[PDB]
């Protein structure tokens, strides 16, 4: 119900978004997934301070391990980038500090899940920094395992970040992408041995289009329209937002030019 | 064997011919035989060719032989190279091997001949012969850290005055 791009969702859940992105230039649809993949910001541990670690894993091994852990990233858009916040080092308006305390309680194996993470700085009341669980059993990922008098004491300073800087800041997972099932654009030349038709399978996406008809001659003037995407969220940002924030961030850095361009005109000609 | 031959009409018609191939060499007394061509009979023993047909025929077999080695493997080296080689093994009277028996040990340049093989023994007799060393060769000028008469150093450089202009 607009005048441009025409999305239509077919199936979509807590973690999946199956839609046809009608009526767009290719160069767009692509730049959309890339910016998606790794240009939206998120929160994830980016500094670990180690008090004691007598586990079987080594310090930086867990340190790395923690980064990857999906931290909630909703109201993340109102947390200053740590590299801007005038505060020396880290602070509460540019970081959610977390703490980890786990000891080998019993003689049986002591699992250290992420549920065991403790927010310690003021959230100034915003949705952000709650480590994320999807585990039925209610346990968020798995950090380390313990046995007896094995202590582990940690302090995590999570920060704002872009995947482009490190994949631990990726809210993307895998992004499905396909245009033109029945290859009517002849964008690909099929490698074969006999009936190229029986040699490749047809993707579910073929039921949404028509057979090429061999009796018809190749269509030359034809550009790529209609893409069959499917975005999956890691979970720190709901599915919908990833795509939405994607569109935004694109639009954003697109304008940061359109502006910066204008900020060079009234620069030389003016004074 | 095949062969290319001038045809009375003009073309280089292919003429097929019978040829004899043999194990072992006595060129001395094979070419004297009636029935054969004693201007084409060829023996890969270039060393024998050297005693029967003189030194300059030698130069030609040694080359052909160095050549047939390179070309036998699909390779190609420009004549002017192997040639130069083949020649060095020739100007010294007769066939002169590529070992401390062939080249060097030929009143060349003690320091030089020394830097190949047989290092002490060379210097020893070099000290008993009272050898004066030319100091023109490459190696002699490396063993002294001087610029050697080579390409860049083949010549001198001087100031011509008059310019002053």
């Amino acid at each position: 119900s607009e005048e441009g791009p025409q999305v239509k969702i077919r199936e979509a859940s807590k973690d999946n978004v199956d839609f046809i992105l009608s009526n767009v230039d290719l160069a767009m649809a692509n730049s959309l997934r890339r910016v998606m993949i790794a240009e939206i910001p998120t929160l994830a541990i980016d500094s670990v301070e180690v008090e004691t670690n007598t586990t079987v894993l080594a310090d930086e091994f867990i340190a790395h391990r923690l980064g990857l852990i999906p931290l909630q990233s909703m109201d993340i858009e109102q947390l200053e980038y740590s590299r801007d916040c005038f505060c020396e080092d880290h602070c509460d308006k540019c970081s959610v500090v977390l703490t980890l305390q786990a000891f080998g309680e019993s003689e049986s194996t002591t699992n250290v899940y992420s549920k065991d993470l403790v927010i310690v700085s003021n959230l100034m009341g915003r949705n952000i920094g709650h480590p994320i669980i999807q585990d039925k059993e209610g346990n968020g990922v798995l950090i380390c395992k313990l046995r007896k008098g094995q202590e582990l004491k940690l302090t995590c300073v999570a920060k704002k970040g872009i995947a482009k800087e490190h994949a631990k800041w990726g809210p993307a997972a895998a992004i499905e992408f396909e245009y033109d099932p029945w290859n009517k654009l002849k964008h690909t030349d099929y490698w074969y041995e006999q009936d190229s038709a029986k040699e490749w399978p047809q993707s579910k996406n073929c039921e949404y289009e028509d057979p090429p008809n061999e009796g018809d001659p190749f269509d030359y003037k034809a550009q790529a329209d209609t893409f069959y995407m499917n975005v999956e969220s890691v979970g720190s940002i709901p599915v919908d937002q990833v795509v939405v924030r994607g569109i935004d961030t694109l639009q954003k850095k697109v304008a940061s030019i359109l502006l910066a361009l204008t900020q060079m005109d009234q620069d030389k000609v003016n004074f | 064997y095949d062969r290319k031959v001038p045809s009375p009409t003009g073309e280089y018609v292919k003429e097929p011919e019978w040829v004899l191939e043999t194990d072992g060499v006595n060129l001395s007394e094979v070419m004297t035989v009636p029935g054969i061509d004693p201007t084409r009979i060829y023996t890969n023993s270039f060393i024998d060719i050297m005693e029967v047909l003189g030194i300059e025929a030698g130069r030609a077999a040694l080359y052909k032989e160095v050549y047939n080695v390179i070309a036998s493997d699909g390779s190609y080296v420009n004549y002017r190279h192997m040639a130069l080689l083949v020649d060095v093994m020739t100007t010294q009277g007769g066939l002169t091997s590529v070992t401390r028996h062939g080249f060097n040990r030929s009143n060349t340049g003690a320091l030089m001949r020394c830097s190949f093989e047989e290092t002490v023994e060379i210097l020893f007799e070099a000290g008993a012969s009272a050898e004066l060393d030319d100091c023109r060769g490459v190696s002699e000028n490396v063993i002294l850290g001087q610029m050697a008469p080579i390409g860049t150093g083949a010549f001198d450089v001087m100031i011509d005055e008059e310019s002053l202009v």
Partner: protein
């Protein structure tokens, strides 16, 4: 070592799925194949993160001090 979080390739969080995996075999009497499909691991980029995993951690802890 220990199950990694997120499959190198894609990125889908796998770290939390280790237990569920084992539990689906020994307790539910299934094969590694259909166990991976109960876990939401459709893409094979991730399938090999779990399937080819080796939990050295168990034998690591076995040591005392």
């Amino acid at each position: 070592m220990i199950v990694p979080v997120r499959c190198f390739s894609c990125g889908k969080v796998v770290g939390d799925k280790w237990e569920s995996y084992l539990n689906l075999l020994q307790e539910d009497e299934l094969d590694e194949g259909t166990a991976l499909s109960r876990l939401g691991l459709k893409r094979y980029c991730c399938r090999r993160m779990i399937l080819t995993h080796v939990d050295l951690i168990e034998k690591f802890l076995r040591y005392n001090p």
